[PDB]
């Protein structure tokens with residue numbers, strides 16, 4: 001409602017760097033563009049099908065043994081390559097992600113990492129086989145290639161420990177950690193995972209897994225995030241979930257795929273990051289394919305309100321959100337990533353919501369850096385003018401006031417150009 005509240009909401013661009021590889025530089029250009037358009041965060045899937053992030057030390061202790069760091073890396077590379085051997089690269093390094101966090105911090109952009117499980121973990125599944133964990137995959141109408149078997153303790157201990165090490169790295173570097181939990185063995189159930197889980201009475205074990213991951217996150221000072229799919233499926237509460245989880249809500253599903261309504265989750269106390277399916281772009285999707293092609297995503301940045309949760313009509317239904325997230329996915333990871341399409345889409349979201357997005361502070365930052373470090377040998381006339389310009393700076397401006405901001409920075413330049421001994 002207020003100027004302050006709107007700017008305090010999260011405005012997030014999501015990048016699926018799990019299915020598909022992105023260079024440090026491509027990610028830095030995304031954060032750049034995120035900063036310029038007044039976003040607050042970049043949500044970066046690192047484990048999503050492919051596992052595209054390796055820590056310097058990947059030693060894992062589970063199952064009463066330890067798996068050598070070198071073995072863990074080699075296995076993961078193999079797992080990720082088997083999902084998709086991307087010719088542009090395999091995994092980002094620790095040094096790369098650390099630099100991306102520092103860089104994003106310098107531009108007032110948070111990073112929100114995601115490592116997906118128990119679904120979307122093709123690469124982890126293969127890696128576990130290579131490390132001597134047999135049959136880690138869930139098994140329904142056929143053996144899953146995507147999802148871990150909830151009954152396999154050996155696989156479960158390994159993954160939990162692996163997610164731990166990832167969370168240890170992000171602790172004190174990022175505020176939020178997304179553990180995902182979307183799509184339970186959809187490839188093995190004709191996209192009816194949750195129905196299969198309830199049918200087999202494994203849904204309770206699903207919640208246990210999810211609740212464990214939320215507690216792990218919290219223990220290490222990370223806000224846990226997850227997608228909506230798995231929580232209180234079909235609005236039933238026979239099986240309980242951690243209430244502290246930030247729910248990234250993208251859709252209520254479709255016929256026979258009966259996700260909890262956002263009304264039901266709100267009534268359970270959840271906060272949402274509005275990740276509306278309407279805003280999805282899948283790299284390379286064409287009009288003729290239906291779903292999230294670029295021109296529909298761009299049109300929806302106007303048509304679907306900022307605060308509208310999927311399946312609800314806003315403002316008739318008005319549920320509290322912490323902010324909204326626009327998502328770029330790489331379902332066919334060999335599709336070409338075309339920066340400008342993403343930029344055009346980010347820009348369109350920001351342009352239709354100028355009251356939510358910050359102005360562009362990059363020019364201001366450039367100018368503040370041109371301030372001399374000592375500045376003790378200049379006149380008092382020169383410095384009074386620089387004091388007054390520095391004081392008149394406004395960091396609270398939204399995207400409707402670029403001009404108002406540019407003037408302020410112009411005066412800072414003039415005062416800096418105005419100094420003299």
Ligand SMILES: CC(=O)N[C@H]1/C(=N/O)O[C@H](CO)[C@@H](O)[C@@H]1O
Nearest residue numbers: 120182227250280282329330331
């Ligand atoms: C949370 C989520 O969105 N999960 C999948 C998805 N579910 O509808 O659609 C996207 C685009 O097809 C996929 O890339 C996602 O991995």
